[PDB]
Design an enzyme around this catalytic site. Structure first.
Site, mmCIF file in Angstrom:
data_model
loop_
_atom_site.group_PDB
_atom_site.id
_atom_site.type_symbol
_atom_site.label_atom_id
_atom_site.label_comp_id
_atom_site.label_asym_id
_atom_site.label_seq_id
_atom_site.Cartn_x
_atom_site.Cartn_y
_atom_site.Cartn_z
ATOM 1 N N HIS A 232 -9.663 -2.479 9.931
ATOM 2 C CA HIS A 232 -9.137 -3.037 8.866
ATOM 3 C C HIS A 232 -9.968 -4.203 7.968
ATOM 4 O O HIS A 232 -10.709 -4.234 7.193
ATOM 5 C CB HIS A 232 -8.024 -2.766 8.270
ATOM 6 N N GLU B 146 -9.323 4.690 6.171
ATOM 7 C CA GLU B 146 -9.167 5.140 7.353
ATOM 8 C C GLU B 146 -9.283 6.047 9.042
ATOM 9 O O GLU B 146 -8.968 5.762 9.899
ATOM 10 C CB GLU B 146 -7.578 6.210 7.187
ATOM 11 N N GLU C 271 -2.534 -3.376 7.011
ATOM 12 C CA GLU C 271 -3.390 -4.789 7.037
ATOM 13 C C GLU C 271 -3.398 -5.730 6.215
ATOM 14 O O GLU C 271 -4.559 -6.241 5.498
ATOM 15 C CB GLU C 271 -4.356 -3.684 7.444
ATOM 16 N N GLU D 42 1.183 -1.315 -0.085
ATOM 17 C CA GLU D 42 0.117 -0.059 -0.143
ATOM 18 C C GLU D 42 0.235 1.321 -0.244
ATOM 19 O O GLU D 42 1.981 1.085 0.671
ATOM 20 C CB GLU D 42 -0.741 -0.086 1.333
ATOM 21 N N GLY E 84 3.599 2.816 10.478
ATOM 22 C CA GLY E 84 3.287 1.617 12.124
ATOM 23 C C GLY E 84 2.752 1.024 12.025
ATOM 24 O O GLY E 84 2.982 -0.704 11.988
ATOM 25 N N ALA E 85 1.934 -0.339 11.145
ATOM 26 C CA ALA E 85 1.794 -1.481 10.538
ATOM 27 C C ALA E 85 1.036 -0.749 8.909
ATOM 28 O O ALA E 85 0.398 -0.281 8.880
ATOM 29 C CB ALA E 85 0.943 -2.024 11.337
ATOM 30 N N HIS F 237 -6.310 -1.106 14.978
ATOM 31 C CA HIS F 237 -6.199 -0.583 13.830
ATOM 32 C C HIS F 237 -6.067 -1.720 12.952
ATOM 33 O O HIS F 237 -7.308 -2.025 11.783
ATOM 34 C CB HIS F 237 -5.581 0.651 13.855
ATOM 35 N N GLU F 238 -5.199 -2.567 12.685
ATOM 36 C CA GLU F 238 -5.102 -3.570 11.353
ATOM 37 C C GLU F 238 -5.831 -4.327 11.354
ATOM 38 O O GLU F 238 -6.196 -5.352 10.581
ATOM 39 C CB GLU F 238 -3.706 -4.468 11.457
HETATM 40 C C1 LIG Z 1 -3.310 6.152 12.429
HETATM 41 C C2 LIG Z 1 -1.334 6.445 12.274
HETATM 42 C C3 LIG Z 1 -1.294 7.193 11.613
HETATM 43 C C4 LIG Z 1 -1.969 7.956 10.611
HETATM 44 C C5 LIG Z 1 -1.873 9.088 9.736
HETATM 45 C C6 LIG Z 1 -1.344 8.505 8.380
HETATM 46 C C7 LIG Z 1 -0.012 7.243 8.837
HETATM 47 C C8 LIG Z 1 1.234 6.896 7.006
HETATM 48 C C9 LIG Z 1 1.643 7.729 7.636
HETATM 49 C C10 LIG Z 1 -0.292 6.490 9.642
HETATM 50 N N1 LIG Z 1 0.491 5.396 10.220
HETATM 51 C C11 LIG Z 1 -0.293 3.968 9.574
HETATM 52 O O1 LIG Z 1 1.143 3.148 10.361
HETATM 53 N N2 LIG Z 1 -0.588 4.041 8.857
HETATM 54 C C12 LIG Z 1 -0.968 2.885 7.596
HETATM 55 C C13 LIG Z 1 -0.625 3.276 6.547
HETATM 56 C C14 LIG Z 1 -0.482 1.835 5.409
HETATM 57 C C15 LIG Z 1 -0.375 2.615 4.030
HETATM 58 C C16 LIG Z 1 1.550 1.303 5.794
HETATM 59 C C17 LIG Z 1 -2.098 2.107 7.715
HETATM 60 O O2 LIG Z 1 -3.059 2.429 8.349
HETATM 61 N N3 LIG Z 1 -2.494 0.969 8.540
HETATM 62 O O3 LIG Z 1 -3.572 0.711 8.662
HETATM 63 ZN ZN LIG Z 2 -5.059 2.144 8.587
#
Ligand SMILES: CCc1cccc(CC)c1NC(=O)N[C@H](CC(C)C)C(=O)NO
Ligand SMILES: [Zn+2]
Ligand SMILES: [Mg+2]
Ligand SMILES: [Mg+2]
Length: 890
Positions: free
Chosen positions: A305, A324, A268, A124, A265-266, A301-302
Site C-alpha cells: 500500500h 485494495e 498501512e 481508516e 488485520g492491519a 499487503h500493508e
Molecule cells: C485483506 C483482508 C481483508 C479482506 C477484506 C476486508 C478486510 C477488512 C474488513 C480485510 N482485512 C484488513 O485488515 N483490511 C484492512 C482494512 C483497514 C481499513 C483496517 C486493510 O486493507 N489494510 O490495508
Molecule cells: Zn489494504
C-alpha cells in the site's frame, strides 16, 4: 438512513494544507489541540465550513485567533461542526480546536483507543474525526506536524508518522516527541502509538538509490521474541516491490507495531503500519504453521500500500477497490513468489469461489466499485478485495508480464502524490494494451464493466473435433444473472487461458494461449490438432467466473492425472465432487421428502477413487496439492449450486461420499500418514525465525488432513497415533490432535492438555479457542458455554470473541440445528457486541449471509433472528444498514 452516491462526487470548497497536532495523553483523558492551515478552493461558493467530528468534547474553537462561540458562530451536534459562512475567511486562515477524547473507554477500536497498555489509533475509513475535527474524506490531502506527550514511565515509546524531529522532557514525569511527515496524505493514513514497546531493528539499503532505511518492528515486552519473522517478511516485501515493480521505500524509517485489540488485520499508515498481533507475531514453538503465511501476506499487503494507496491514494471511497484490489493482487504475486507452492494460488481461488461467490449471489451483491453506501465500513468486502484482486490480475493475464509492468508504471508515476480513480488505472492499462496490440485504436472500454457490473459470470463450453481436418473448436458462452444492480447484464472481456491435452499420452498439444472472449458467445478454432484433445480451461483460474466445462468425469480424471495446470487439475477434481454431491443430495432429499422406506445412492466413481490413490502414492507429487484432492469442496462453495439447501441432507451427503472414498483408501491414507512423518516433522529451521519451508508445511497439512479422515473413520487403533501426535513440538500437530480426538472419549483429556500448553501465550490461546470451537462434538453447545464461563468471560478483545464463535458457525450439523438454537446464540453475541464494537458485530453476522439459500424453515428461523436484532434499541448504523440490506429492505 443517510445515503452517499458515487455520481455526486464534488471537490471541496476548502483546502487543508497543514495539520499541526498536539496529543497530550493522561490517565483519564487525552487532550487534542489542532491547528489547520486552511484556504478556500476554486470550487468555493461561500458555503458554511462543516467539519466532521464525532464524540468530541470541545474546549475551544477559533479562526485566526478569534474565539468562536456555540450558537453564535458555530453549531456542534456531536457529529458535525458547522462554522457559519459569515465567519469563514475568504483567504488563507488558521482554524484551531482543542478537544477532549477518552481512549481508555473507546472499545469500538476506531479513532484513538487503548489496547492493553498501548494507546493506538485506527483512522481508516472514518476514524480521524473521532480524534479531532476534519473534512474527513480522502481527497483532503495535507502535511502533518504531530507532537505526542505522555507519562514517561507508562508510555516511554511515542510514535507518529514520519521523521522524529525532537524529543523532550516535561515536568511531572512526562515527555514528548515531535514528528514531521513530509508526504501529503489523507487523514485516514494518520497514526499515533504510545506504549512500553520493545523492538527488533535492521537496516535496509534500497536497490537503486541506496537509501538507508531503518526498519523497526514493535510489540509489548512479553512478546518481543515473536517479532523476527515479521521483520524478515518486511525485508522480503521491500525487495519484491523493488524487483518486480521498481519501487523503493520513501522515508528514512518504517515502523510496524503489533497491538492485541484490532478490528481487522492491519493498517498501512504512512511509515507506521499497525497490526493485529495475530498478523505480526509468531514463534515456531507458539504458533501454528498458518501464522507464518498470514504474517507474510499481511506485512506484504500493508507494505505494498505504500505505493498503491499512500503515494497514489483515492479520490473518494467508491474507489476503494483501486487500492485494495490492486494491493491484494500485489500481495498475491508476492506470496506466490515467496512460497513457490501451487497451493498459494489455489487458496486464493478457494476463498473467492466460496465466500465471494456467496456474497455475489446474496442480497448484499455489489460491483467492485459500488454506486452508493451508508457506512463505508460495510464495503470493505471480499467483493471489493478478492474479486477486485482478480480483476486486477486479469490485466496481467491479458497483457503479459512485460506490458503489465509498463502499464503499472504509467499509472503509478502519472498519479504520484495525488488521488486517483479506477478509470485512471484502466487508462494506464489501456496504453499498455495499445502498445502490445501495436494498434492505437485498440481500447479497454469494455473492461470497465468489471468495475460496474455485479454478479458472477457463468462461462460454458461446447466442443467439436474434425479428425480429417485435424481441427478443433471451443464454443464459449457467457451469462451473468440479472440482479438488483442491473436488470440487463452486458458481456464482459473474459480472458480464458487454455491448453489442450492429448488423452492418449497425457501431453500438451498447443503453446498455452489466452482466448479473449468479448461477446456473449464465440467459437475459437485450432488447427494442426492431431487427435481429439481434452481442453484445459481457465488455467490459473484466469477470470472470476463459474466454469461449466461440459466434460465427462473420465475426461476430468485424465486432466487430474496429466494436465500441467494446478488449478485445472484441482477444478476438474472439484467438478467431479460437485456432480456427486448434487446427485447424492437429490437422492437423500427425495427420500426424506417422500418418507421412503428404501432408496438408492449413486456410488462415488471408482476410477476417480483410483486416480486419487495414484496421485497420493506418487512420491514426486505435491503434498499440498494432495491435501486439496482428498477434501470435498467447502460448504460455502457447494451452497452456490443449491437452492433451498437442507443443511442436514448436505451433511449426510458429505458423510456418505467421505465414507465411500475411505472405504477404498484408508489403508493408503494411513500408510501415507506414517511415511510422511520423518520429512514433515523434521526440526530443521525450528530455531530460525527468518526462514520457512513452505513445502514442509504442506507435508504437515497433508498429514493433519489424513489424520482427520482416519479419525472420523475410526480407523483401527488410530487413537494411538492421535496420542503420539499430541506430543509433537509443532503446534499445528498438537492442536490437530485435539480436533481429531473429538471422535474419541480422549477428547476432554486432550482439551486439558492442550489448554495448558496454550494458556500462557495470548495468541496461542486464541488458536486453542478456534480449535475447540471447530471441534466435531455432539456436545458443542455445552462446550461453548464452558468456554464462555472459563476463558472468554467478559473479554472485549475481538480476537477472543471471533475465536470462540466463528469456527462453530461453520459446523454444518450443529450451527444449523433445526431448533434455531445456533442462530439464536450467534444473534445474541452480535447484539451484545454491537453495544461496544459495531464493526466486529457486523463481522459476526457472516453466517446469516446465506439465509435466503436455505430450506424454508431455516430461512424463517434466520430471518426471525435478523429482524429481532434490527429491533434492538440503539442498534448501530453499521449493523442496521447491514441487516436492512441483507433482509431486502434497503
Ligand atoms: C485483506 C483482508 C481483508 C479482506 C477484506 C476486508 C478486510 C477488512 C474488513 C480485510 N482485512 C484488513 O485488515 N483490511 C484492512 C482494512 C483497514 C481499513 C483496517 C486493510 O486493507 N489494510 O490495508
Ligand atoms: Zn489494504
Ligand atoms: Mg468522546
Ligand atoms: Mg487478553
Amino acid at each position: 438512513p443517510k445515503i452517499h452516491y458515487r455520481k455526486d462526487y464534488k471537490p471541496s470548497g476548502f483546502i487543508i494544507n497543514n495539520v499541526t497536532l498536539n496529543i497530550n495523553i493522561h490517565d483519564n483523558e487525552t487532550i487534542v489541540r489542532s491547528v489547520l492551515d486552511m484556504d478556500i478552493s476554486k470550487h468555493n461558493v461561500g458555503e458554511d465550513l462543516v467539519f466532521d467530528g464525532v464524540g468530541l468534547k470541545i474546549n475551544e474553537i477559533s479562526i485566526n485567533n478569534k474565539k468562536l462561540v456555540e450558537g453564535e458562530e458555530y453549531t456542534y451536534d456531536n457529529e458535525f461542526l458547522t462554522i457559519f459562512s459569515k465567519f469563514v475567511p475568504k483567504s488563507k486562515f488558521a482554524f484551531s480546536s482543542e478537544v477532549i477524547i477518552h481512549p481508555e473507554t473507546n472499545y469500538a477500536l476506531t479513532g484513538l483507543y487503548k489496547s492493553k497498555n498501548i494507546i493506538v489509533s485506527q483512522c481508516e475509513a472514518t476514524g480521524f474525526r473521532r480524534i479531532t475535527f476534519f473534512i474527513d474524506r480522502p481527497d483532503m490531502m495535507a502535511k502533518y506536524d504531530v507532537t505526542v506527550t505522555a507519562d514517561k514511565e507508562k508510555y516511554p515509546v511515542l510514535l507518529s508518522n514520519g521523521d522524529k524531529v525532537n524529543e523532550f522532557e516535561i515536568p511531572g514525569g512526562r515527555h514528548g516527541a515531535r514528528f514531521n511527515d513530509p508526504h501529503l496524505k489523507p487523514c485516514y493514513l494518520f497514526a499515533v502509538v504510545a506504549g512500553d514497546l520493545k523492538h527488533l531493528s535492521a537496516t535496509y539499503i534500497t536497490k537503486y538509490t541506496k537509501k538507508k532505511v531503518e526498519l523497526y518492528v514493535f510489540s509489548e515486552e512479553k512478546y518481543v521474541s515473536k517479532l523476527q519473522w515479521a521483520l524478515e517478511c518486511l525485508k522480503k516485501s521491500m525487495a519484491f516491490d523493488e524487483d518486480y515493480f521498481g519501487l523503493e521505500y520513501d522515508l528514512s524509517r518504517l515502523n510496524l507495531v503489533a497491538v492485541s485489540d484490532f478490528n481487522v488485520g492491519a493498517m498501512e499508515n504512512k511509515g507506521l503500519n499497525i497490526f493485529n498481533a495475530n498478523s505480526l507475531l509468531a514463534s515456531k514453538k507458539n504458533s501454528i504453521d498458518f501464522s507464518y503465511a498470514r504474517i507474510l501476506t499481511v506485512v506484504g499487503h500493508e507494505y505494498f500500500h505504500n505505493y498503491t494507496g499512500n503515494r497514489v491514494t483515492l479520490r473518494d471511497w467508491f474507489q476503494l477497490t483501486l487500492k485494495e484490489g490492486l494491493t491484494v493482487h500485489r500481495e498475491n504475486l508476492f506470496s506466490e513468489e515467496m512460497t513457490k507452492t501451487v497451493t498459494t494460488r489455489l487458496s486464493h481461488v478457494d476463498l473467492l469461489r466460496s465466500v465471494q461467490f456467496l456474497e455475489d449471489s446474496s442480497p448484499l451483491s455489489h460491483p467492485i466499485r459500488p454506486e452508493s453506501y451508508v457506512s463505508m465500513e460495510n464495503f470493505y468486502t471480499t467483493t471489493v478485495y478478492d474479486k477486485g484482486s482478480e480483476v486486477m490480475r486479469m490485466y496481467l493475464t491479458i497483457l503479459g508480464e512485460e506490458y503489465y509492468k509498463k502499464g503499472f508504471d504509467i499509472y503509478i508515476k502519472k498519479n504520484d502524490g495525488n488521488t486517483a480513480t479506477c478509470e485512471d488505472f484502466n487508462y494506464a492499462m489501456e496504453q499498455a494494451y495499445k502498445m502490445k496490440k501495436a494498434d492505437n485504436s485498440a481500447n479497454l472500454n469494455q473492461y470497465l464493466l468489471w468495475f460496474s457490473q455485479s454478479g458472477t459470470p457463468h462461462v460454458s463450453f461446447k466442443y467439436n473435433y474434425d479428425a480429417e481436418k485435424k481441427q478443433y473448436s471451443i464454443h464459449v458462452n457467457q451469462y451473468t444473472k440479472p440482479d438488483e444492480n442491473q436488470k440487463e447484464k452486458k458481456p464482459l472481456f473474459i480472458p480464458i487461458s487454455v491448453g489442450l491435452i492429448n488423452p492418449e499420452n497425457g501431453k500438451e498439444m498447443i503453446s498455452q494461449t489466452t482466448l479473449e472472449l468479448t461477446k456473449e458467445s464465440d467459437t475459437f478454432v485450432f488447427n494442426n490438432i492431431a487427435v481429439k484433445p481434452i481442453p484445459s480451461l481457465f488455467r490459473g483460474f484466469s477470470a472470476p467466473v463459474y466454469i461449466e466445462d461440459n466434460l465427462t468425469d473420465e475426461e476430468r480424471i485424465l486432466l487430474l492425472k496429466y494436465d500441467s495446470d494446478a488449478f485445472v487439475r484441482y477444478n476438474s477434481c472439484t467438478n467431479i465432487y460437485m456432480k456427486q454431491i448434487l446427485m447424492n443430495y437429490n437422492e437423500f432429499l427425495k427420500a426424506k421428502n417422500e418418507k421412503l422406506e428404501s432408496f438408492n445412492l449413486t456410488p462415488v466413481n471408482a476410477q476417480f477413487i483410483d486416480a486419487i490413490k495414484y496421485l497420493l502414492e506418487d512420491p514426486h507429487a505435491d503434498a499440498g496439492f494432495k491435501s486439496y484432492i482428498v477434501s470435498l469442496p467447502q460448504d460455502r462453495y457447494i451452497i452456490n449450486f443449491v437452492s433451498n439447501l437442507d443443511t442436514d441432507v448436505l451433511a449426510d451427503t458429505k458423510e456418505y461420499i467421505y465414507k465411500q472414498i475411505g472405504d477404498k483408501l484408508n489403508d493408503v491414507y494411513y500408510k501415507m500418514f506414517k511415511s510422511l512423518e520423518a520429512k514433515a516433522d523434521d526440526l530443521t529451521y525450528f530455531n530460525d525465525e527468518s526462514h520457512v519451508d513452505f513445502d514442509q508445511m504442506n507435508m504437515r497439512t497433508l498429514r493433519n488432513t489424513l489424520l482427520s479422515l482416519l479419525s472420523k473413520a475410526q480407523y483401527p487403533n488410530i487413537l494411538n497415533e492421535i496420542i503420539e501426535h499430541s506430543k509433537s513440538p509443532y503446534p499445528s500437530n498438537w492442536l490437530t490432535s485435539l480436533s481429531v480426538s473429538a471422535y474419541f472419549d480422549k477428547y476432554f483429556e486432550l482439551y486439558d492438555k492442550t489448554y495448558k500448553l496454550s494458556k500462557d501465550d495470548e495468541l496461542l490461546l486464541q488458536e486453542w479457542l478456534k480449535t475447540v470451537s471447530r471441534s466435531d462434538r455432539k456436545d458443542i453447545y455445552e462446550i461453548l458455554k464452558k468456554l464462555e464461563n472459563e476463558v472468554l468471560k467478559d473479554s472485549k478483545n475481538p480476537n477472543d470473541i471471533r475465536a470462540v464463535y466463528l469456527p462453530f458457525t461453520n459446523n454444518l450439523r450443529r450451527f444449523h440445528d433445526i431448533s434455531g438454537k445456533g442462530y439464536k446464540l450467534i444473534a445474541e453475541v452480535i447484539t451484545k457486541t454491537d453495544k461496544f464494537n459495531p464493526m466486529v458485530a457486523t463481522q459476526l453476522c457472516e453466517p446469516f449471509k446465506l439465509w435466503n439459500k436455505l430450506d424454508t424453515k431455516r430461512q424463517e428461523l434466520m430471518l426471525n433472528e435478523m429482524n429481532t436484532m434490527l429491533q434492538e434499541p440503539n442498534i448501530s448504523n453499521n449493523l442496521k444498514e447491514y441487516l436492512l440490506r441483507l433482509t431486502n429492505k434497503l
